[PDB]
Design goal:
Keywords: transferase
Radius of gyration: 18 Å
CATH topology: Rossmann fold
Number of helices: 13
PDB class: transferase
Assembly: monomeric
Entry title: Crystal structure of mouse sulfotransferase SULT7A1 complexed with PAP
Structural class: alpha/beta
Strand content: 5-15%
Name: Sulfotransferase
Helix content: 40-55%
CATH architecture: 3-Layer(aba) Sandwich
Number of strands: 7
Bound molecules: adenosine-3'-5'-diphosphate, calcium ion
Length: 282
């Protein structure tokens, strides 16, 4: 019985009941709900960890929404507090009802060469993921989208369509590394929360990779809270967390090919070009 399975043409972990997934639009959003959206390996925790570190904001951060049985919906309706709800769903599969309420989205994004790698790595090291021997095997799938949650490019695009909607904010991983505070603001703001220089500086302190990397047990109460449906061992996510490495895995060929598909898919995607002003200088 597989480690992965495919729903509507996209691979998912068997830890996402298909029950759960046919049932999504039966999700009943709250005007206030929040969603931290990303394609795998894209700052997810980073982001989510960052949220939790916001003080007395009143927010219960929630286990992934495409993780589990239909009941997860049950699990969800009982959170009396405001919900920040993590997901890697694509737009289409995002619950209509979320579309209908215009719940705020935060969609975080990172250049796709770095994502691929980070990823490949994740296939290697995670027993919920059917490992792949060599880098080049995984890239082919990536470029096909033959990875869980499907094609990078599609994820981003679908999402990018709503980049100019009011309850939506895009964020760039990269931009998190560069000037984390300018970012944080951008958020606090979207969320219309005030948090001061001191405080913001505390979060920065608390959330540094290596900081985030020192860890082994529990959060605010008892049973471990998972935030990425795929991940059960948080110790697995902190690998290198810089920008750039992809220059230590792409062969001149794979790059040419990559840059052409990229340029083919990300035609006139503003976001496209921004991710290019980065490795442009990076
Ligand atoms: N506080 C932090 N600062 C920078 N990068 C971080 C980080 N926390 C996690 N990461 C990076 O986030 C990536 C994982 O993404 P996700 O949260 O979606 O699973 C990893 O990339 P790397 O493989 O390059 O190290 C990890 O290194
Ligand atoms: Ca459209």
């Amino acid at each position: 019985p597989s480690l992965l399975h495919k729903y509507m043409g996209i691979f998912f972990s068997t830890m996402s009941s298909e029950e759960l997934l046919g049932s999504l639009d039966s999700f009943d959003a709250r005007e206030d709900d929040i969603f931290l959206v990303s394609y795998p390996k894209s700052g997810t925790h980073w982001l989510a960890e960052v949220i939790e570190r916001i003080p007395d904001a009143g927010i219960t951060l929630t286990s992934p929404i495409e993780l589990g049985d239909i009941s997860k919906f049950e699990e969800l309706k009982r959170i009396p507090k405001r919900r920040a709800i993590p997901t890697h769903l694509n737009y289409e599969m995002l619950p209509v009802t979320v579309k209908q309420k215009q719940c705020k989205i935060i969609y975080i994004v990172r250049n796709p060469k770095d994502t691929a790698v980070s990823m490949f790595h994740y296939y290697r090291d995670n027993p919920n993921l059917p490992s792949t021997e060599t880098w080049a095997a995984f890239l082919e799938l990536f470029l096909k989208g033959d990875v869980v949650y499907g094609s990078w490019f599609d994820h981003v695009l679908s999402w990018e369509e709503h980049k100019n909607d009011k309850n939506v904010l895009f964020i760039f991983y990269e931009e998190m590394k560069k000037d984390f505070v300018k970012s944080l603001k951008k958020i606090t703001a979207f969320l219309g929360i005030d948090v001061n220089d001191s405080e913001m500086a505390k979060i920065a302190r608390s959330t540094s990779f290596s900081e985030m990397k020192s860890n082994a047990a529990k959060e605010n109460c008892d049973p471990n809270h998972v935030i990425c449906a795929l991940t059960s061992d948080r110790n697995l996510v902190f690998r290198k967390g810089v920008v750039g490495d992809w220059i230590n895995y792409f062969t001149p060929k794979q790059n040419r090919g990559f840059d052409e598909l990229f340029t083919e898919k990300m035609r006139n995607s503003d976001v496209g070009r921004c991710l290019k002003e980065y490795a442009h200088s990076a």
